[PDB]
Amino acid sequence: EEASFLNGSDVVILIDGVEELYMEEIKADFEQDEQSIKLLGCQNEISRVGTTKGSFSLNGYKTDSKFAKLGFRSFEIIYNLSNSETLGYESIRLKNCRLKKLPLINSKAGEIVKIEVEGSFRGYDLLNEL
Amino acid sequence: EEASFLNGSDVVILIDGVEELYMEEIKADFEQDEQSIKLLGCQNEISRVGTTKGSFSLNGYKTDSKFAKLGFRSFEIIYNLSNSETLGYESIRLKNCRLKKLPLINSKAGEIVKIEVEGSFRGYDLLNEL
Amino acid sequence: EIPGFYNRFKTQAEKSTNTGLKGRLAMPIRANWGDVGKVVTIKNDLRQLKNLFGDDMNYSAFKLGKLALLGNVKELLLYRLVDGNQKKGTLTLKDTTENSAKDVIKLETKYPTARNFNVTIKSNLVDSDKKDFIFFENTKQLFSSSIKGTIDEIVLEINSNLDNEYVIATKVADSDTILANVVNQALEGGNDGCTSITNESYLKALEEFERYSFDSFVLDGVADEALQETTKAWVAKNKELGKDILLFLGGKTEDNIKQINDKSKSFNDENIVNVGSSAYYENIKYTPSEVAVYIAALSVSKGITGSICNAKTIFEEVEPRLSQSEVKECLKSGTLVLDFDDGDVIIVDDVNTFKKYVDDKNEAMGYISNIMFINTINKDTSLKRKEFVGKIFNDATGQTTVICALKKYFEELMSQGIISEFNVDIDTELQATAKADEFYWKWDAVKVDVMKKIYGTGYL
Amino acid sequence: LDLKGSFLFDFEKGEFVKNADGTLKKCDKVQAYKQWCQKAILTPRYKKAAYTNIYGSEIKDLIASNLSQSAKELEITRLIKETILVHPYTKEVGEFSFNWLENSRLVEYEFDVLTIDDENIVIDG
Amino acid sequence: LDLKGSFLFDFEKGEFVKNADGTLKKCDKVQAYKQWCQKAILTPRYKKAAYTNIYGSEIKDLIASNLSQSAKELEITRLIKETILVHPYTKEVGEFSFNWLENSRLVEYEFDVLTIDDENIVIDG
Amino acid sequence: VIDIYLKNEKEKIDFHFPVNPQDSLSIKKEKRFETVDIVNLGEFDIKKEGEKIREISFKTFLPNLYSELKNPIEVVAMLEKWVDQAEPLRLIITGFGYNGLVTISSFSNTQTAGREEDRDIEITFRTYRELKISNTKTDLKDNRPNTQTKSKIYTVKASDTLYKIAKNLLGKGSRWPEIYNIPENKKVIGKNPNIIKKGKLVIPSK
């Protein structure tokens, strides 16, 4: 047993090839509409794969009008997670992603102006596997 | 790394060109009904853009019958967020917005008379990008 | 080839039908042609057998090899048994310009044989500076080619062309002028060694076969008692070495039902099978020893799932036709008998020689399919054994790994529908004294059998 | 039906096989049909003016086509199948197989079925 | 059909081309048709009383129209297409293109297809 | 991998669909038969010898910007033109493994509220067939579809002869007087049909 975990401090995100270092949360999932159909002779139901759909959520602290200016244009998100205790790093890129809604305005009381972005992505590429 | 965030204290809101400084919360989103359809040969689903719909929520402390008197008339909301640590400011205006419901009455116990407004807006304009 | 469209046509018999076959068989064949004194594998192709050992039906190679091939065996391990006295067809060709007629080229058959390879060289009518070298097998042309007069090219050209799988040229000496014209000069001096095969010579094939692995072994269509007893001991020896070989035999041609049944009763090993009937195939008789080749091939080809309880054989007629009582005696004696039914020769009941005891659980051991099922599992476990003997740490995790491997392997047999229920577990008794390669385990399974008989009762 | 025999022609040598008598080697109806099938495959369509539009194939023209691999496989199946089936003796051609043994160099199989290959029902009143 | 030839007329010079003999330069049916097409395009409809309602176009009147750019593009396509197609020799006109090279000053292309441009099927029983 | 190709021939256009057929393809097959009842026996099925026309349908969208591409408006105009084409179209579907002559029965485009540049398409095809209206004897069947097209005007080559042009370009070859009797062909060709020159433009009939 050894400590080889990873921390969000190591996260590096290039929104369209630009380091959006101000994003303090990110998550992306690649789900499949697995059809499940029940066969006559088989007791247990059979699950059949289907087409995949990529969704991603990304929220941070506002520092400019980047996303509002970006609009619904297609773009790319490159995510790099690097182990610092030992060398090696994971690197992912969402092949073609679009926003589902512009967080046009958001603010409340004395709190910092947080920004939340949600969208979908067609596909992905796994550039490094650790 | 440097501190260049923004705080809701810097928020300036002109409801129909009038400083409604008593609103201590605002948020507006500009969402799109992104159609998602699955193609025969492509494993991953294809997402197709659609028409946009603008929604906004705005709540504060009551100080007059402005909103009840306003009714469902169309109007404009100009939002200005200004960086104070460094110069520069964002400026948005919701091009054509209407209330979805008049908060006609609301009060409870010894609490301050808060007011909550929800509506939709047809479009927007980005007047400054920081 | 040039870019473009090319096409050919082939008879449907030339289809690559070798896919999907099963089983491995061995044979100490007598052959007129091919490699001598070694085992060779054939992938169930008639042409491959034809090229490797010719097509002389007089010789046991092509004859029995064809029958085993018709049995749909995945791989046939043929050994060219020989008497000795082995020789290759050879010839020496001579030069013209030297009045002494200098010998310059020696030709030789690719393999030892006695067939009539012949050479005819004539002046090339287009150009005397060349000559046409036509290679013959008896009166049949076998290969033709024109050649330059220089000796080195002539040996090269003979060894160059595709159709010289039969003969290889060799230079004895150099010369300038072309070889002398000759017609149909036989490559004398060869010998196939089929003459007067010794009883002992079979034993050489046995030892050679031992290094290989095969599902069953069948004799070369010979009912000699000494060979059968020798092979009986040989197969029994290989069982003690872990090699589970199934033996197929057939009694002598003149043996009656009494002799055959006594022979089967005399040795009732479950690894031994006696054929008690000759058979016909396009007017060519096959003695019970010869028929055992086809019986062995069918049993081996069926593998685990199938059986030959009522398989329709390729044969056309069986000389000894037995009544039900005679069938019952032969079947009770462990004799495997083919029966004629409505123009069809059908093997009956899948029996082996083991019928004397059938002590309760050993009743199943009297059938070939049951024994084949048992032997294959032992082979599969033996394969998995040798991957771990003294090569994995004998710990509980490692032992659990072995059990997981064996348990999953049996689960594949469940997927085939072969087995209804199975269990594999730690042999706690023999586990009390474990060592590096002496971990011990136990198992038992319930083989699914093929439907054999039906009883109907018409209530009225 | 009464199809008739024809004369052998070794496509390997590109010459007619003739007996020692010197007469050309006759052969069976079925042999003639197989001889015809290979010839029709090798004859490009619409180009050799002796024959009508029915005869011949178009496999050579497919080489220059820009269709994908899978599309070319179907076109090969259509072209070979159409060319052969014009003969009365053909019953069915199919079971096509393909093997792109190199990056862009192909080997394909197909199986032909004769009229005589049909299975006949056995019954009479 | 038997369309007939006509006489050249250099639209650049606005005069008939005549040979050194002094006779007007005759030209081919297809040349005559091309000569006719340009003339019909330049002839406004309903205004030059010599011709019936079939002849002529209305492109000039579209200039004063208040329709949007895209609407004017379709009207140009309709007007040019309608004017040309009256001729028997026309098969099809289309593939229109537009380029508003300045703010409100336009250049457009279109492609004409003759009756002879048709492709004919090759077959007979 | 899946692709769709429509190889029009009367217009030598090899259209390739930019977009795969949305959700799912499907082709039916139904044996052509009739049902008949018999007194005291009941229903029976009688097969009818003829085959049956069957349809292939799907839907797509012609995107504005994507691999070869063209404007959706022109593509719709292309297909709508092809709908009225009497001559058949060759449809090939790679992954589905379909290949045969078809003709477009119905076609429809659509502009959604957003995505105004794209055009949602719903198309339907019908399996195509042909109607082929002394010394009786067995001969080759006329199964080959005759889908091949040539220009309506021919440029004579060096080795050509008027009979050869007729056979290559009009079938039987004895059809040459049809080419010659056209007055334009008579004018360009000499008064001797047997004599011809490389270049002369010739107009096959129809």
Numbering used by the authors:
A (entry chain Z), B (entry chain Y): 8 to 137
C (entry chain g): 13 to 472
D (entry chain l), E (entry chain k): 24 to 148
F (entry chain T): 2 to 67, 75 to 141, 150 to 215, 217 to 223
What did the published study say regarding this structure?
The virion can be divided into five distinct regions: the head, neck, tail, baseplate, and needle. Structures of purified φCD508 virions in both extended and contracted conformations were determined by single-particle EM of frozen-hydrated samples; the resolution ranged from 2.6 to 4.0 Å for the extended phage, and 2.9 to 4.2 Å for the contracted form.
The tail is terminated by the baseplate. The baseplate is minimal compared with other structurally characterized phages consisting of only six unique proteins. The baseplate is also expected to include the host attachment proteins gp67 and gp68, constituting the tail fiber and receptor binding proteins that bind to the C. difficile S-layer. The association of domain III with the triplex protein gp65a wing domain increases the order of the region such that good density is present for domain III. Peptidoglycan hydrolases that facilitate enzymatic penetration of the cell wall are a common feature of phage baseplates, including in the recent structure of a diffocin, a native C. difficile tailocin. It is striking that we find no obvious auxiliary domains with structural homology to peptidoglycan hydrolases in any of the φCD508 baseplate or needle proteins built to near completion within our cryoEM maps.
